[PDB]
């Protein structure tokens, strides 16, 4: 489902990243990067590694 | 006269429908009644493949809203949304920004269309 969600979000906002709306796009960009780059010593329940693929896609 | 154009519009006699509505515009006693005529008349030019011509009637319909101390009517809501869309293609983001905010008191789908456009023009402003 999280992979399905990630491709879903990416497709809806396809071609919305060529910005030099940017504030919310930048906020969504940094939020996704937080998901993909976060390192957790203790596994959190509601942010597992299963969402990593969806965030990348 | 308004009815005749609709019949002409529905029968693919668009060249005739332009003059029909133009006759209707003179017969109207009050300008406010022309708001509906202006929008649909502008559409008839759009299908006649000349976007420049329809801008002049498009100016008038929105300007009626200002002349009526902000009537904020439905057929100007679709006018302002289309005008802002074309202005983005024209590259004039500042001239398109005020159009989106002025139409921010319409329907549920109308306000979101202008709000997103307002963010689009404010990005390049």
Swiss-Prot record, chain A:
Present with 178 molecules/cell in log phase SD medium. Signal peptide: none annotated. It comes from Saccharomyces cerevisiae (strain ATCC 204508 / S288c). The APC/C is composed of at least 13 subunits that stay tightly associated throughout the cell cycle: APC1, APC2, APC4, APC5, APC9, APC11, CDC16, CDC23, CDC26, CDC27, DOC1, MND2 and SWM1. APC1 interacts directly with MND2. Component of the anaphase promoting complex/cyclosome (APC/C), a cell cycle-regulated E3 ubiquitin-protein ligase complex that controls progression through mitosis and the G1 phase of the cell cycle. The APC/C is thought to confer substrate specificity and, in the presence of ubiquitin-conjugating E2 enzymes, it catalyzes the formation of protein-ubiquitin conjugates that are subsequently degraded by the 26S proteasome. Belongs to the APC1 family. It comes from the Eukaryota. This is Anaphase-promoting complex subunit 1. The chain holds residues 1167 to 1249 of 1748 of the full protein. It is found in: Nucleus; Cytoplasm; Cytoplasm, Cytoskeleton, Spindle pole.
Curated annotation (Swiss-Prot), chain B:
Phosphorylated by CDC28, which is required for the early mitotic activity of the APC/C in its CDC20-bound form. It comes from the Eukaryota. TPR repeats lie at residues 1-31, 35-68. It is found in: Nucleus; Chromosome, Centromere, Kinetochore. Belongs to the APC8/CDC23 family. The APC/C is composed of at least 13 subunits that stay tightly associated throughout the cell cycle: APC1, APC2, APC4, APC5, APC9, APC11, CDC16, CDC23, CDC26, CDC27, DOC1, MND2 and SWM1. CDC23 interacts directly with SWM1 and binds the destruction box (D-box) of the substrate cyclin CLB2. Component of the anaphase promoting complex/cyclosome (APC/C), a cell cycle-regulated E3 ubiquitin-protein ligase complex that controls progression through mitosis and the G1 phase of the cell cycle. The APC/C is thought to confer substrate specificity and, in the presence of ubiquitin-conjugating E2 enzymes, it catalyzes the formation of protein-ubiquitin conjugates that are subsequently degraded by the 26S proteasome. Present with 80 molecules/cell in log phase SD medium. This is Anaphase-promoting complex subunit CDC23.
